[model samples]
Target chain A: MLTYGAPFNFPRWIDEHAHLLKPPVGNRQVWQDSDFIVTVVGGPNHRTDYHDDPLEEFFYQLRGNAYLNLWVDGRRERADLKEGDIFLLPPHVRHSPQRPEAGSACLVIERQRPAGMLDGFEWYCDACGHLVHRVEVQLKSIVTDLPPLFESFYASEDKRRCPHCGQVHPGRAA
Target chain B: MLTYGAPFNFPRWIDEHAHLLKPPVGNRQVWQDSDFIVTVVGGPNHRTDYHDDPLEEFFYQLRGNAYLNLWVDGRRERADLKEGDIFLLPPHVRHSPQRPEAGSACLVIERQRPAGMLDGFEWYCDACGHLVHRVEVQLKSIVTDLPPLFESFYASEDKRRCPHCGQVHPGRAA
Candidate 1:
C-alpha cells in the first residue's frame, strides 16, 4: 500500500506546511488542512520570538541537539531533544524556539491544512510588545479519533487545565 | 512522508508480486522476465498436484493456514505457514502440495515475459495418474535486485541447487 510521489515532493510539502527555517517568532504560516507537516529546525545559534497559534506541533530530532522552550498556558518548560527524540506542542499553547551554539537539526511536523486561518486571538509577542500573533477560536482540535500512535495529550481534547492559566476559553464548553 | 488519498472503493494499484502472498505447495508458478509471479495453495481444503517449472518460486501467505510438502532433489520436507509469512523455492525443486481440512491460499512470483523458450517441465500425479502440475522453465527472475530485506540471503550471484531433484540454475549474480 505504498506509492511513490503520490502528491508532491517531501521537502516542498514540508516547507509549505511547517516552514523549515521560520520559528514561532516570525509571521505565522497558515494552513487550511493537512494530514501532517514536517520541517527541519536546527543550525547555529539563533533565537526566535514567542507566540502561539491553533496548530499542533511535533518536533523529531534528526541530527545533533536543540533546546525547545515551550510556553503552555502561562508556564514555561524546556527540553533538550537529540537525535531520535520528539516533543509535542499543543494547539494555542505558546512556544519559543532556539538553536544551541553547536547547532542541531530536527524534523518538525505541524497538523494543519488549507494554509491559513486566524484563531480567536491573533499571536501577540509579549516580550517584543507587538501584535505579531493571531488566533482563530473556531479552530477545532486536529488529533481527534486518530490512531493511538498519533494521539497525545497535547493534541487530544483531554488536556490539563494549567494552574498558571486558569481560564479555559468560553467556546470550548462541550 | 504520507499523502492523503481520495476516498475510493478499490485499491489504486494491484501488485502482481509474490511478496504479497504465500507460495504454492508442490509446483512453481513461474513468470519469465516479468515483474513477478503469484501463486496460491492450501485454502478451503483442497489437494493439488506438483508442478515442474524452470522459474524460481517465492511463496507468500495471504490468508488461512496450511502445510507445505516440498520435494526437491529427490528429498521431501514439510513446513507450516500462516498469513504474513513467506518462503522461497529454488529452481527445479520437485514439490507437491497438501492442504489441511481448513483450506489456505498463497501466491507465487517469478519472471515471465518476452515470450518463448522452454517453459520448464510438467508432472502427473503418480497415485491418481492425473496432470498434477506443470512448470515453465527457461524463464528469468522478475526482480534483478532483491529488496534490502532479502539481499542478505539471495543477493549474491549464485546458482540454486535442488537437493531433492539434483537440479541447478543460475541466479542474479551479485
Candidate 2:
C-alpha cells in the first residue's frame, strides 16, 4: 500500500461517540483535510441564532425529527425533517435549526469556505423582529470557535437587549 | 424578501422527480449555483469505472442497500450501506459504488472542484485486476460530460484489454 485511508462506518462512529453526543456536546466533525466539511450534529439545541453563510449546507436527518426554521420571503417558515430525510439549504438563507427532543442528530455536509467568505450569526428580537446582535466570523473550527461567540453574547444582558422593543434574548440553560 | 431560497423537502423532491430516477436516468443534480454539488443518485447500476477525484465525497443511503466497493491499502474492500447509513470517502480513494437492485438510491455530496483539479475514470481487468484504461477529465457537467468517455472506453476493445494480464473488461448490458 502506498498510502491508506478507510471509509467512515457511521454506526460505529455513533456508538464510539455516544457519550459526547448529548447535552452540551452536540456537534462532531466527521473528518479533516478534505474540501468538504462533514459534521455529525446532535441536539437538545435551543439557539435562536440564524446562521447566514455564503455557502450551501446539506442535511440528512439521522434520528428523531427536527425543524429547519427559516427566514425566507420576509417571513418565518419551517421545513420538517423526519428520520432518513435529506434537505439542502441554499446560500444566504438565514436558518435556525431546532431539535427539541431526545435522539436528534443529523449529518450535515458543507464545503470549506474559501479565502474571505465570512459566516454571520444573528439574533432577532422575539417580540419585535428587530436585529439584536450580529457577528461576522471566519469560522476556523466549529467546536473551538463557536462557544466564545455564543457565551460572550449570551452572558451580557445588554447585548441581548433589543433596542426596538426592549425585549431580551435569554441565554442557554445551565 | 430581497431574495429567496427554500430548504429541500426530500420526500417531496423524490416524488416530483420519480420519473427521472429510474433506469437510463439514474442521477439528478439536486440544485445549481452552489459550492456543494448535491446529487441524488439512483441505480440499477453496474459499472467498474472507479472514480478518482481530488476531493472528498459523502454518501447517504436513502433507499435500497448498496456497496461502496473501494480500493484502499492496495486491496479491495466493500462498505455496506443500508438505508439511512452515511459514509464519507476520503480524497484520492478509488471507489466504484454499486447499487444492483431496484429502488436503490443514494444522496451524494461533494464540493465544486477548484480550477485545475481533474477527475479520473479507470477500469481494471475483472480477472487479473490489471489497469485496462485511465483517463483524466475536467468534469464540468456530469450529465453532459460522462457518457462520451464511458462509451469511447467501453466501445473500444483495445481500450478494455489489459496490457499486463491480457484480460478483457466486459462492457455494460445492452
Candidate 3:
C-alpha cells in the first residue's frame, strides 16, 4: 500500500505565498517530480506584448476570466477562457495572454523533460515594460549545437531581444 | 508550452467518474494509465465503516488529521496521524477510517494490477454493523481458485468465528 500526500506533504511555500499572488506577480510551487506555479493579474487592460519559449506550458483558471491572445502557425486569434477552462501553449509559437477587465487569477504548470533546464529566464511578456529574460549566461553551455548569439542570450552576460517586438529584452535567444 | 491553471481555467478531469458523485461524498479518481483508485476524504470526525478489497491501499493526509484502525496479518492496531502522515494496508486488510476532528482531509490511493477485478462482493462486518461490500459475482466465481484468505480473524464477512479461527485461514481445497 502506498499513501501519497499524507507522508510526503507539500512544502509550506505553497500556502504561505500562493495566496499573496497579485497582478504582475507570479509565485511557483515547485516539487521534485512536478512543478506548479500560480499567477494572478488585475487591471483595466493592456496589450500582453508577445514572446515565445521552448518548453510546453499549460494554463488553468481557478477564478475569474481572460482573453488569451494567441499566435500560432502564422495565424492570430483570441481565445476567451472563463472559469474552469484550460489551454496549452506549444514550444516556439509566438503567443501572449491578457485580461481586458480587472484581470483574473490563474495557475500555470510547465514541465521540462530533463528538468532544471528552466531554472531562469521563464517569462516573456511584450508590454510589461520590464526585461523579459533579464538574467544573462553562456547559452552554448545550456542549449547544445547553438550559435554565438544564442549562447549570449542564456548568459545575461548578454541582452537578447523580444522576438515579438524585436526589442532588446536582455536574455538568451533561440 | 502547457499551463495548468490560469485565472479562471481548469485542466481536464484526471479521471472519469463511473457515476455522478453525490455531494458531500467523495469519489475515486482512478485514471486508466495508473493502476490505482485515488480518493480524497473530506470533512471532519466522520466514520467510513469497514471495507476490504483485493488491492494494496495507502492513505496520505493532505489537509488535516485522522485515526486509522486497521486489522492486518491477524493483528490489529490503531494509529493517529496528522498532516503529512502515511499508512499502508495490504490487500484484504480490514480497516476503517475515522476523522474525529474537523478539517481532517486525506488522500487514499489503492493500487492493483489487472484492473477492475475487485468490483464485486458484499463483505459485511457484523461487529461494526457495516456493509463492507455489496457482493460481486466475480469474486464468488473465483473463490475456489483464489489463494487462501489472509488475516481471516477480522474478515469474517459476518463476524462469525469459524473452526479455523486460531489456525491458518482455510481455503477451498482445489
Candidate 4:
C-alpha cells in the first residue's frame, strides 16, 4: 500500500538511476494505487509499432526530447515534445514514442487497468503502410509484460515481414 | 464531454493567458473527464486555510516556486518545489500551497470526486496551534465551489478569530 505522506524527489531519482535507464527497455514504477499509476520511462530506441491503450496516458518529458507519432481519427500526426512538455493521449489512440539518446526520460501516468480491458500493439508495413501484425494483451504489469512482446517481434523474421507487401519491418538491433 | 483526439499546448496556453491568471484566485480547467481532471492554477498569494482533499492530487510546478505546507502524520511539513518539480499528495491530507509572484503556475491533476465524497477546509490557530474552524463541502467544481468558501472565510471576521488564543488570521486584503 502507498502511504499518503511521503515526498519523492523525482529529478534526483532519475539522475541517480540514469545508468539503469539506458537500455532499449528501461522503466521504473514510481507509484501505483487503485486509481492510477506513475512511472519513469526511458530508453535508447523507438518502437516500430503503435500502441492502442485502453486507458488515458499522460506523458511529461523530463530530460530530453520526445517524438510522439500518433494515429488518431484515421489520420497520423506527430508531436515534438521538449523538456517540460506534457501530452495527454486519450484511450484507444494508436501512438509510438521515440526517445532521445541514452539517459533521456519521461514521466508517464495512466489509470490502473480495469478487469477485461484490452491493450493492443500493432505493426504497420514501412513500405506500404499496411497493417502488418497485432497482438492484444491484458496488461498484468507494464514493467514485466511489454518487453517480451518487443523481443518476440524483433527476434522473429517472419513477424517482421508484412504478408501483403512482402516488405520487412526493420527491428532495432540487439 | 471531453474529446479524445484534442491536443493541448499547456505552456503555450499559459503564456497566452497570463493576463487572465494574475488574480489571487486565477485558474483554468484544461481538461476533465470521468477518469481525471487537469487544471492550471496560478495566483498572487496563498490560502489562509488548509485544504483536506477527498481525492489524491498531483502538482507539477510550471513556473516560479511553490511552497506546500502540509499537515500529515501528526506533524506539519513543508515541500519547497521549484520549476519542473512534481509532488503527489495522498487523499485526506491537509495542504496549503503558496505560489510565487503573479506568473507562477502549477498544473494540478486529481480524480473526479466519487458520489458522496466530502472535501474539507481547516484553519489552525497560529498562536496556540489549536483547531480554529473547519468547513465540510462536497466539491462540485473547484473553480465555482472553492472561491465562495474563500470569500466567506475572508468576509467574516468571526471565522478568522482563533477562539483559544483570541488571535485572528489576517486574510488577504484587496
Candidate that scores best on TM-score: 2
Residues A61-161, candidate 4, lDDT per residue (tens digit)? 77777777877556667877677577777778788888766777988887767689989998887787787788888887876788789789888779888
Which candidate, 1 or 2, has the higher lDDT?
A: 2
Task: Give one digit per residue, the lDDT tens place, for model 2 in A25-48.
Answer: 877877775667878777777677
RMSD of model 3, in Å? 11.4
Better of 1 and 2 by TM-score: 2
Docking class of 4: acceptable
Which lDDT tens digits does candidate 2 get at residues B1-174?
212144445767776886677778987887776667888788778777889978877787878788877777777878777776777777788888888877777888887777799999988777767788998988888877889999998898899889988877786542
The C-alpha stretches of model 1 lying farther than 4 A from their native spots are A1-35, A101-103, A119-174, B1-174
lDDT (10s digit) by residue, model 3, range A29-114:
33222222223333333443344445555555545676666654445666666765655555555555665444345555443234
List, for all models, the DockQ compared with the true complex. Answer: 0.03, 0.34, 0.16, 0.27
How much is the lDDT of residue A96 in candidate 4? 84
lDDT of 3: 0.44
For candidate 2, the lDDT comes to 0.77
- Which candidate wins on DockQ? 2
lDDT score for candidate 4 against the true structure: 0.75
lDDT of 1 by residue, B1-174 (tens): 001111111111112322333333232332222233333343333333344545444444544555555553354456555554544455455555444533345544443334564443334333333332333444444233212223322333222333344333222221
User: Please, what is the whole-model Cα lDDT of each candidate in the order they appear?
Assistant: 0.39, 0.77, 0.44, 0.75
DockQ ranking, best first: 2, 4, 3, 1
Candidate 4's clash total is 0
- Order of all candidates by TM-score, from best down to worst? 2, 4, 3, 1
Report the lDDT tens digits of candidate 4 across residue range B67-145.
Answer: 8887766677787767767777777878888775688888788776767998899788777877778898888787788
The TM-score obtained for chain B of candidate 4 when compared with the true chain B: 0.87
